[PDB]
Symmetry: D2
Subunit: 249 residues, 4 copies
């Protein structure tokens, strides 16, 4: 009886309600942003989130993302910056995570993120040290803060527990807090507390998002190399696959 | 009788009211963001904006900016990207422009911006072609849209009219519109319509802001060259000076 | 296969999501307000709204109401006003109507309402003349405006069409409009346009709400007569019954 | 040098900024609501609030009120209720109080109020017992809660201190709290804490407001007696006068 997809009704009610919530919070959500790629389920065994639904409070890895901007920022750059442009760009999106649900452990080789909680509270789990990239020297300036240890009783998705092992640093973000920076090459994940009366709504402002997803499969590449380039590295292999497509029956 | 500064009372009422407006619109404004550098007057002859005040509707070049993020995004970058990092980074700020007032004509060599109107309407004036940088090849991808001609009856600041000559393209942005990208090297300016019942409030998401201002004079430089580096080029010379400091009597 | 109740999952996702939307729009929703009486289905044949769900856009009579205040306002009144107190009082609630759905035709003998659209648009159908109450003279001051005729193509609930016959006056309300008064004794109904991208959210400020509902069955009566007193008169008999209780399986 | 009026510039910047704040918080403010009666100064010696301004934090009695509704609710009432209609009606308004400022001690013979804090925090001072009205029996149901004693260090307006003597009960209201009822005949006053970073914004839902003010001098009376009827009883005589008119030079 393990779900393997989400019904069209479950998908729409989930995504359309989320888009309305976004508008209420003044996020500029256009029609094109409300599509079949906005609702994400990280892996086949994560569809079980829809057995009891998004308000069950159960630990599953799924979320909604409404992307309002993913600008390469390639125009006006000196030609020499061509091979390093992929680390820049501007990506603005609204992320909605229901109680107990998670944006699973992963890291980006090029994308640096920043978080602004709009509604609810965000519990971020991360590795304070970056992932070492063999054979390449990396610049350093502020690094990541050590943060605090995890609070007790954090329910993790069944069969995904170990993927969180290395994300020992923890921080709870709220509306009004200083913007929070998640440097590239750092493992990170986050969830909405299970006892939350509202979905976690977060505004993410980051560098360009390289993702040959479903809603982004057919566009033009600003720079040759960018073509097909992937910048998502999920700790759990089950997460990497289902990320680029949601099975809607 | 030409004003040469702004009284402490005029400054505070202007900036503190704006910060409250920002909070109401859910922008994460912290205490440190509400400072003596947030309220900007572009040039000595622009202080006359305070003869009749911010609700007079008169054409002057002055605005408020509450910066919530100006992240270099240098961490995790390969060393080779060092000389091109200045074109990246993440800068999030809230800008408040009162009726009739303007963010004066200028362009950035490195910073690419994007606009999201939160309240009111934004009238953007810009040059659809970038400024040619002698002796250097530049990348290209989307360029800037031609836009529309200026509507009639746009009152410009006295003695600043000609600075707008080259910003022939025009567009009026509203809340809910697609994010608007202003590529680096493009001349641009914007104002809040004079008949607006509310101040124009805009969320700007751009690449790093290189500005050795008053509230940013003493920090650490992520990369050597960044030190003292300026990235603001106002068409009117009077604007470049008063930009980095507000005279509060 | 005609639904006869709503599953606990359908109920919670419907009501809890609505409460979150309410909070985002700054309505003061407390825990006690989010209960099993907030989600209303007007009649047994209206449960079919949940065959395709609240985002189907189909015409059904169901809505959500989060009541933040229902103050008798009896304290401090001269004893003589006792028999007329039932026409006063203060009731503040947030109403959420999904696309295509309706608050069915009905009128109140004592309650006068006022509407403020917070999100979406509200299409009100009403009778510009009050219902004559046999053997009693009534005061008059402003009466109700004639309004406009119905726009074409308004899909009404199957088997409930005729209940709308007398509500010939029509008006479409939006956020920012002047408060709209619906005097007592006037037939009225309203819906969220079927093509709306967001649920209709309306703040109602009215006189006391006399309703021996499920969440209001056991309180104390400020005045003797008020006990058991009913003030809802739905045109369709099917609506009056299911109003005071929602079948949650 | 004691101010005796408010300049047109001080008035407009105060009221127009407040109206913008109101809109941001989604209060339906129309053009007609933004008038010369919205900004209130309670007495000649209260104009000194404008010596240092609304952000000085100093204790003065002045506030802004944007009334969106003041419905008699007389239509549909049985003729017998005519002499008691004045205790009913529906009045919806947004009140804005700057740091340290107060809505001065007063009570209403007919109007019962309810408070909903939208922004900031509201400190209410009141008398838990109603004012006895000689020769008339009054109904009772819930009465007023005893509340808590005043916190220490509450700066009161100079020369108005004693007017607060009897308002010994205290409560601090915040956004999201249950609606707060202030029954008619109860002395009450409230202020925005002096250390607040934002103005106190409160939505008031009450029974009809009988006030032959400046913006309400020339309308039609729903009931004969209502004509000229006053329902404001300020403890300080200086407050009653300046209430109905603001001196704008
Ligand atoms: O799938 C997650 C998506 O790519 C988000 O924008 C960020 O990485 C979450 O950290
Ligand atoms: O102001 C700094 C902020 O609170 C966080 O510590 C950093 O963004 C983490 O990268
Ligand atoms: O002084 C203007 C400031 O630098 C702003 O962030 C942008 O450039 C306006 O286009
Ligand atoms: O969606 C594109 C947007 O409306 C504007 O045309 C561009 O951002 C301009 O750069
Ligand atoms: O069931 C409807 C409820 O009683 C509402 O508050 C109003 O009457 C709708 O007009
Ligand atoms: O301002 C009046 C408003 O627009 C409506 O016409 C009335 O409230 C209807 O009762
Ligand atoms: O002048 C105060 C005004 O009348 C307000 O609506 C309430 O009474 C304040 O309690
Ligand atoms: O819920 C009751 C509320 O908190 C206040 O105690 C009353 O309205 C006071 O009248
Ligand atoms: Co990420
Ligand atoms: Co610029
Ligand atoms: Co009704
Ligand atoms: Co009062």
């Amino acid at each position: 009886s393990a779900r393997t997809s989400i019904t069209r009704r479950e998908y729409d009610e989930w995504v359309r309600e989320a888009a309305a919530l976004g508008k209420a919070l003044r996020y500029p959500i256009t029609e094109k942003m409300v599509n079949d790629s906005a609702g994400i389920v990280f892996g086949a065994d994560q569809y079980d989130a829809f057995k009891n639904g998004m308000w069950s409070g159960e630990p599953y890895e799924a979320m909604i993302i409404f992307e309002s901007l993913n600008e390469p920022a390639v125009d006006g750059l000196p030609t020499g910056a061509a091979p390093y442009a992929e680390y820049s760009g501007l990506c603005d999106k609204l992320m909605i995570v229901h109680p107990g649900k998670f944006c699973p452990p992963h890291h980006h080789g090029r994308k640096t993120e920043s978080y602004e909680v709009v509604l609810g509270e965000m519990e971020v789990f991360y590795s304070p040290t970056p992932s070492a990239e063999s054979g390449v020297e990396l610049l350093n300036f502020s690094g990541m803060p050590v943060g605090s240890p995890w609070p007790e009783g954090v329910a993790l998705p069944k069969g995904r527990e170990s993927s969180y092992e290395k994300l020992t640093s923890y921080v709870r973000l709220r509306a009004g807090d200083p913007k929070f920076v998640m440097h590239r090459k750092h493992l990170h994940a986050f969830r909405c507390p299970p006892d939350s009366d509202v979905p976690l709504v977060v505004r993410e402002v980051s560098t360009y998002s390289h993702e040959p997803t479903e809603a982004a499969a057919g566009n033009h590449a600003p720079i040759p190399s960018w073509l097909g380039m992937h910048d998502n590295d999920f700790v759990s292999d089950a997460a990497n696959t289902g990320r680029l497509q949601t099975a809607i029956s």
